[PDB]
Enzyme design. Structure first.
Site, PDB file in Angstrom:
ATOM      1  N   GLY A 167       0.804  -1.225   0.000  1.00 39.78           N
ATOM      2  CA  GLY A 167       0.000   0.000   0.000  1.00 39.78           C
ATOM      3  C   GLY A 167       0.845   1.287   0.000  1.00 39.78           C
ATOM      4  CG  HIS A 189      -7.260  -7.865  -2.271  1.00 36.05           C
ATOM      5  ND1 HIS A 189      -6.254  -6.919  -2.371  1.00 36.05           N
ATOM      6  CD2 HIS A 189      -6.621  -9.084  -2.343  1.00 36.05           C
ATOM      7  CE1 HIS A 189      -5.099  -7.578  -2.493  1.00 36.05           C
ATOM      8  NE2 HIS A 189      -5.246  -8.895  -2.485  1.00 36.05           N
ATOM      9  NE  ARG A 195       5.180 -12.373  -1.609  1.00 36.31           N
ATOM     10  CZ  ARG A 195       4.235 -11.805  -0.835  1.00 36.31           C
ATOM     11  NH1 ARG A 195       3.546 -12.501   0.082  1.00 36.31           N
ATOM     12  NH2 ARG A 195       3.973 -10.503  -0.996  1.00 36.31           N
ATOM     13  CB  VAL A 251       0.689 -13.945   5.432  1.00 39.14           C
ATOM     14  CG1 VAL A 251       0.184 -14.014   6.892  1.00 39.14           C
ATOM     15  CG2 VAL A 251       2.125 -13.400   5.430  1.00 39.14           C
TER      16      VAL A 251
HETATM   17  N1  LIG Z   1      -8.358   1.673  -6.954  1.00 36.62           N
HETATM   18  C1  LIG Z   1      -8.162   0.594  -6.201  1.00 36.62           C
HETATM   19  N2  LIG Z   1      -8.915  -0.508  -6.433  1.00 36.62           N
HETATM   20  C2  LIG Z   1      -8.713  -1.591  -5.671  1.00 36.62           C
HETATM   21  N3  LIG Z   1      -7.849  -1.771  -4.675  1.00 36.62           N
HETATM   22  C3  LIG Z   1      -7.118  -0.665  -4.467  1.00 36.62           C
HETATM   23  C4  LIG Z   1      -7.212   0.522  -5.168  1.00 36.62           C
HETATM   24  N4  LIG Z   1      -6.299   1.445  -4.677  1.00 36.62           N
HETATM   25  C5  LIG Z   1      -5.685   0.813  -3.709  1.00 36.62           C
HETATM   26  N5  LIG Z   1      -6.132  -0.473  -3.529  1.00 36.62           N
HETATM   27  C6  LIG Z   1      -5.651  -1.425  -2.536  1.00 36.62           C
HETATM   28  O1  LIG Z   1      -4.580  -2.186  -3.051  1.00 36.62           O
HETATM   29  C7  LIG Z   1      -5.022  -3.531  -3.363  1.00 36.62           C
HETATM   30  C8  LIG Z   1      -4.248  -4.058  -4.547  1.00 36.62           C
HETATM   31  O2  LIG Z   1      -3.102  -4.811  -4.074  1.00 36.62           O
HETATM   32  P1  LIG Z   1      -2.073  -4.091  -3.077  1.00 36.62           P
HETATM   33  O3  LIG Z   1      -2.782  -3.708  -1.821  1.00 36.62           O
HETATM   34  O4  LIG Z   1      -1.322  -3.031  -3.816  1.00 36.62           O
HETATM   35  O5  LIG Z   1      -1.063  -5.292  -2.751  1.00 36.62           O
HETATM   36  P2  LIG Z   1       0.299  -5.331  -1.893  1.00 36.62           P
HETATM   37  O6  LIG Z   1       0.421  -3.963  -1.269  1.00 36.62           O
HETATM   38  O7  LIG Z   1       0.116  -6.424  -0.869  1.00 36.62           O
HETATM   39  O8  LIG Z   1       1.406  -5.627  -2.872  1.00 36.62           O
HETATM   40  C9  LIG Z   1      -6.549  -3.427  -3.454  1.00 36.62           C
HETATM   41  O9  LIG Z   1      -7.169  -4.661  -3.116  1.00 36.62           O
HETATM   42  C10 LIG Z   1      -6.857  -2.352  -2.407  1.00 36.62           C
HETATM   43  O10 LIG Z   1      -6.970  -2.886  -1.105  1.00 36.62           O
HETATM   44 MG   LIG Z   2      -2.255  -6.572  -2.105  1.00 38.66          MG
END
Ligand SMILES: Nc1ncnc2c1ncn2[C@@H]1O[C@H](COP(=O)(O)OP(=O)(O)O)[C@@H](O)[C@H]1O
Ligand SMILES: [Mg+2]
Lengths: 363, 634, 363
Positions: free
Chosen positions: B347, B390, B475, B478
């Site tokens: 995030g 998600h 990978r 969790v």
């Molecule tokens: N526009 C968006 N649509 C959906 N999810 C979003 C959006 N902006 C941010 N996110 C957050 O990021 C997720 C996408 O994966 P991400 O959180 O980036 O994975 P990681 O950070 O674990 O690599 C979404 O499920 C949501 O929780």
């Molecule tokens: Mg994610």
């Protein structure tokens, strides 16, 4: 192991001197040949003791004789630096070997002060120079000219005994080609650290003996002789010293020469140092146990134990105090070959090898 | 690097080397770092002839100038050649202040100038060149040898050593290293290390554990036997311990480990750490380095999804150049929109931009957030979907090509992107779109030649009723023990079989009941600047900790009486994974189990977790990803 | 097989730069700390192109700046030899290492002749000087200061490229510790034989770059920038060079300082030569293959096979020109370390690794 074999091979070399593989003076240019030396041995035999003394001993009693610095200067190499105090000289001269120019260290007994008699601080200055030339990968040429090192009260109070033995220890174990050259007189403990060489030469009118001819006077009083007779009997001539194997060569050069015999000096130094280097290369192909010695020597530098390191610190000897100024494999060949050279010109026999003198008609 | 690689293949196989070199000089647009290429390649050619003897030819052609000319081309052991009409000065027209005569630049006039070359050869393309050059100046030195004459004379004067049977260009391939595992390095801490140490016992593998100073006395270290090893990495933080890849590799080499499990977090998803192990012949438990770079690079993950007919989350599809580019792609998608970092994840640096007026300042801002956080300011744009789930789908795949897709999870109850209440199904996802994401996971798994465990992530837009590929986890994830229950397939054991070189064809993915995971974390409730309730970490010594034994719950934990929760690491103290027949029963059993669970000394997130399980909207299964911060304000 | 191993190790060490054992920047005493470097990055970021040019570019162009000889003289050691040959300045000075004095070789680009712009005979003198220090086991401090080597008609008629290719070949294959120190500007192929060192340092206001910043004007015309913008975009400050991993630290000294910071230059040299020697000993402790490489190189000196012996005659390279002047085992370690640091200063990726730009919204 190398240490066990080093005594064994040098002990085998002492059994038969004549057809030994240690003869490098046949390849050196600028020496008197065997034929010239045989004619002079007839002359030294046919002369009385007075004529022997005038030919051999009297030219080193010349107070105007060209010094050890001046003999180095007449090489006509490039002077880099010189270190000088009293009767100690040392220098670093870049001499042309024909193929290229090369830095060669020079350590020299200079006769223009004290007749060449070294004090304890000169043996410690010679040690400092011997350390430097080992670290800096430079062949050494020793020049020997002295009445002997000073044996006076201030010398023994300054611990002359330890200073001499430290200089013999560091010279015996230095990791570069050492070529001694007797340019006047060499006697006892003051001459033997500088005569500890891979090749030991003389000039045409030098001397090399156990002690000075005049110091045999105490022994001459036992047998009712002159001191002159004793020196003629034991043979202090460069020609008789060549015949007894004490020196490798007599350079056809006296310090005052102005013809092509002044060129023999330079050629003799160049072809001595190239012969010592060729001999180290041949011995490295022949010996697997020299390789094992280089590993054991380098492995204790990789892991310096407190007991080993503490004795080296107390001693302050020529050692690998840097990996860059650590010796090569050929350095270990120069310490090994220098031992063989010095060891094959000492001889001793057993009680069964010695034949008894007749007691018949001697009450 | 290509020249060093070639001279290495030539040294291994005993090949003569031929080179045809043309250059404008060293690449100035690569920084000052480019200069070192002159000494690198020249040293490899100096060492190649002085250790391996084989002749290097250097045919300078075209323009042969700058540092290529000034080093390896004219190196004194190589046989230097030039083609007719080659421009060969020290530097070219871009650097030279004034005119240089053809006597000092053209290879023709330099041909008879000593040490310039071993010969001037004919240019075999330009038909009339030597007559065109003779019409310019008849006193110009002409070429004499051919390139074929120089090569046949170079090859025929060598000793023709008997050639070995041909091998391919040998590269990093884990499949060769995949041999039976009886001792493994586990690159992890915490609940992930406890999970992997437990799986090592269950598969009958000895653990070589590595740890920081707080973690030498942690529960994953206590779980080890006398036959298992523990090694000190030193220090307190990640930088002083787990992120030192050379220390971890030196332990893998020292213990002579059969494989290395790269864990989760730290260096788990880095293709550099995967390559580092496989260079030294140490088996990496997971995908190939090729599969990691294809689905780890965000633009190439989208482009591979596009090629496999998998819908992506609409955006720029490549990386944005500037603020004007960001405005135009955002306008085409329709505002509000996302800006995300390419080397992001968790995030981090995800900014929402509401307007074109905002985008000009917010692009420059979020480029500084990405550049500060990662050392790369590269943004890429995506469509901001406000009502989503998600959804993420677990892949397993062997080296033979069996894409066993185990099932999906829904991880929509999340706080600052970090997942909190995770599930085995989605209560708003149609079975037709579930079938589409199952098919897309197989298409991606087969078309990248993926190995080990992986999780592809999807946005399931609640407003549109569509599923879009977002990115992939290359990978172990969790959330995995939720899918271990409901697929009937052990994910870490299947990954350890795959990394032993075995097939997973024999596996049968099921849909066994339902499951849910709450991440139990050591956090206290505290208000923000407006008075809305937040959770923030509570470190300290645990005094009492009881998890009652229950058959349909799995407990992975580092919490016990007398252990401390370290401030240098995450507040994750347990994963509590409930199983049951249906979703209401799983929620009710997990609610009842969270009240039977006790923790003291530390504070925990459990007062919030109990209230989500007693919410009517959550019990109906009607929510989205932004449910949790709204519900914490209620 | 050390040739295969050095690309393996250097590829491993370039996968994660920060936690690699190629980080010797902690060792050198007299460098600026990482906090002052971070603070100087914040200032260079917040300044414009004119403020960047004033901070970085203008002090290296300064004609009042102390030359190579003046900097070497104010190390306050004992000079043993000098060779001033146009814009080349080789030297040799004894420095105190606390335990004892040591010969340290020098090869410097002198800004008070031709601005430090090297000619073909200056590269051939640098070739010769690098063998000369290797034959004597003397560590070398290179001093970098040049507008680049000459691209003129006289240089290319004398075969400029062919003198530099030999100079880089000697530097890469020298058997002694090499330290680089940028004392002004390190531009192009004139800077790289000297910057090919084990540890490449810079003075506080030095520069190192692919070409002189005015030469970027052709690339500035092509893309519609100024050459000053291209120079900042390339990132040529000592802080940015340390961040990219081009150099191993910034010495807290500028040529005109006369406070506590003038003492940091000799201290940085002492601790750099000691750091390379401790690191090279640690490499001989752990690399058993470094022995095999040395024995294979030794076997060529014992038996010079005709095809490579003829190449060594025509190429004139730094070889064992004597068994005494033959390199040690640690000599091969300085070549090995020098490759690992040069090869981890360069960095490249793949087509799969590179992030593709947006085609969307492009006219
Ligand atoms: N526009 C968006 N649509 C959906 N999810 C979003 C959006 N902006 C941010 N996110 C957050 O990021 C997720 C996408 O994966 P991400 O959180 O980036 O994975 P990681 O950070 O674990 O690599 C979404 O499920 C949501 O929780
Ligand atoms: Mg994610």
């Amino acid at each position: 192991p190398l240490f066990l074999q080093a005594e064994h091979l040098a002990k085998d070399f002492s059994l038969f001197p004549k057809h030994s593989k240690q003869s490098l003076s046949e390849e050196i240019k600028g020496l008197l040949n065997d034929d010239a030396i045989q004619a002079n041995l007839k002359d030294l035999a046919s002369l009385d003791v007075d004529g022997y003394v005038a030919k051999v001993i009297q030219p080193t009693q010349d107070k105007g004789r060209p010094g050890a610095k001046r003999i180095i200067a007449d090489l006509k190499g490039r002077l880099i630096t010189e270190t000088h105090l009293g009767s100690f000289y040392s220098a670093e001269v870049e001499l042309n070997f024909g193929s290229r120019t090369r830095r060669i260290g020079f350590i020299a007994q200079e006769r223009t002060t004290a007749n060449g008699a070294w004090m304890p601080e000169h043996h410690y200055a010679a040690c400092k120079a011997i350390r430097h030339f080992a670290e800096l990968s430079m062949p050494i040429v020793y020049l020997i000219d002295t009445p002997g090192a000073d044996a006076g009260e201030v010398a023994n109070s300054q611990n002359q005994a330890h200073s001499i033995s430290k200089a013999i220890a560091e010279s015996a174990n230095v990791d570069v080609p050492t070529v001694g050259i007797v340019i006047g007189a060499g006697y006892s403990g003051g001459a033997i650290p500088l005569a500890a060489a891979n090749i030991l030469l003389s000039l045409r009118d030098g001397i090399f003996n156990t002690i000075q001819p005049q110091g045999l006077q105490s022994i001459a009083r036992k047998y009712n002789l002159s001191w002159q007779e004793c020196a003629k009997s034991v043979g202090v001539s460069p020609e008789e010293l060549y015949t007894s194997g004490c020196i490798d060569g007599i350079i056809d050069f006296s310090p005052g020469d102005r013809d092509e015999r002044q060129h023999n000096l330079r050629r003799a130094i160049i072809s001595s140092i190239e012969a010592v280097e060729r001999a180290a290369v041949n011995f490295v192909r022949e010996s697997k146990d020299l390789r094992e010695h280089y590993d054991r020597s380098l492995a204790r530098f990789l892991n310096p134990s407190k007991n080993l390191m503490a004795l080296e610190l107390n001693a302050e000897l020529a050692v690998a105090t840097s990996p860059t100024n650590h010796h090569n494999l050929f350095g270990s060949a120069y310490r090994y070959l220098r031992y063989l050279t010095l060891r094959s010109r000492i001889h001793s026999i057993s009680q069964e090898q010695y034949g008894r003198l007749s007691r018949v008609s001697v009450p | 690097e290509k020249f060093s690689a070639l001279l290495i293949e030539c040294a291994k196989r005993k090949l003569p080397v031929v080179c045809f070199i043309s250059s404008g000089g060293m690449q100035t647009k690569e920084g000052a770092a480019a200069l070192f290429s002159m000494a690198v390649v020249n040293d490899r050619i100096t060492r190649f002839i002085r250790d391996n003897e084989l002749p290097v030819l250097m045919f300078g052609f075209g323009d042969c100038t700058g540092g290529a000319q000034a080093s390896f081309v004219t190196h004194p052991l190589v046989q230097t050649y030039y083609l007719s009409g080659t421009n060969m000065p020290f530097a070219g027209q871009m650097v030279v202040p004034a005119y240089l005569p053809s006597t000092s630049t053209l290879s023709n006039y330099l041909s008879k100038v000593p040490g310039a070359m071993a010969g001037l050869v004919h240019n075999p393309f330009s038909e009339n060149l030597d007559n065109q050059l003779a019409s310019i100046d008849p006193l110009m030195p002409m070429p004499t040898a051919k390139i074929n004459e120089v090569i046949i004379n170079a090859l025929s004067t060598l000793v023709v050593e008997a050639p070995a049977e041909e091998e391919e260009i040998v590269q990093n391939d884990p499949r060769k290293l995949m041999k039976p595992i009886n001792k493994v390095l586990v690159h992890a801490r915490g609940c992930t290390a406890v999970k992997l140490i437990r799986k090592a016992h269950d598969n009958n593998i000895n653990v070589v554990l590595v740890a920081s100073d707080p973690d030498m006395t942690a529960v994953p270290a206590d779980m080890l036997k006398e036959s298992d090893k523990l090694v000190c990495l030193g220090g307190n933080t990640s930088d002083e311990s787990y992120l030192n890849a050379y220390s971890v590799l030196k332990v893998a080499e020292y213990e002579q480990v059969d494989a290395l499990h790269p864990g989760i977090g730290f260096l788990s998803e880095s293709p550099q750490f995967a390559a580092l192990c496989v260079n030294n012949g140490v088996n990496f438990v997971g995908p190939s380095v090729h599969s990691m770079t294809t689905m780890g690079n965000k633009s190439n993950a989208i482009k591979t999804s596009q090629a496999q007919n998998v819908p992506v989350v609409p955006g720029s599809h490549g990386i944005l150049t500037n603020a004007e580019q960001a405005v135009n792609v955002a306008s085409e998608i329709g505002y509000p929109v996302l800006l995300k970092a390419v080397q992001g994840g968790g995030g981090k640096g995800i900014q929402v931009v509401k307007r074109p007026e905002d985008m000009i300042g917010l692009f420059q801002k979020t480029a500084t957030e990405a550049a500060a956080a990662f050392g790369n300011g590269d943004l890429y744009l995506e469509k901001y979907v406000t009502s989503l789930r998600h959804i993420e789908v677990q892949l397993l795949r062997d080296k033979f090509g069996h894409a066993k897709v185990l099932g999906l999870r829904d991880c929509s109850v999340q706080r600052n992107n970090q997942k909190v209440v995770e599930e085995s199904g989605s209560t708003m996802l149609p079975d037709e779109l579930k079938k589409q994401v199952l098919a897309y996971t197989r298409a991606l798994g087969d078309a990248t030649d993926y190995m080990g465990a992986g999780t592809v992530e999807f946005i399931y837009n609640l407003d549109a009723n569509e599923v879009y590929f977002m990115e992939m986890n290359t990978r172990l994830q969790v959330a995995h023990p939720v899918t271990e229950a409901t697929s009937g397939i052990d994910i870490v054991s299947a990954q350890f079989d795959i990394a032993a070189g075995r097939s997973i064809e024999h596996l049968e993915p099921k849909e066994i009941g339902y499951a849910m995971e709450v991440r139990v974390t050591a956090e206290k409730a505290a208000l923000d600047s407006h008075g809305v309730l937040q959770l923030i970490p509570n470190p300290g010594k645990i005094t009492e900790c009881v998890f009652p034994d229950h058959p349909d719950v799995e407990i992975i934990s580092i919490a016990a009486p007398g252990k401390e929760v370290s401030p240098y690491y995450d507040s994750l103290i347990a994963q509590v994974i409930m199983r049951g027949e249906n979703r209401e029963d799983v929620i009710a059993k997990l609610h009842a189990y969270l009240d039977s669970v006790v923790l003291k000394g530390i504070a925990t997130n459990i007062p919030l977790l109990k209230l989500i399980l007693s919410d009517g909207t959550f019990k109906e299964g009607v929510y989205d990803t932004n449910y949790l911060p709204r519900f914490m304000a209620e």
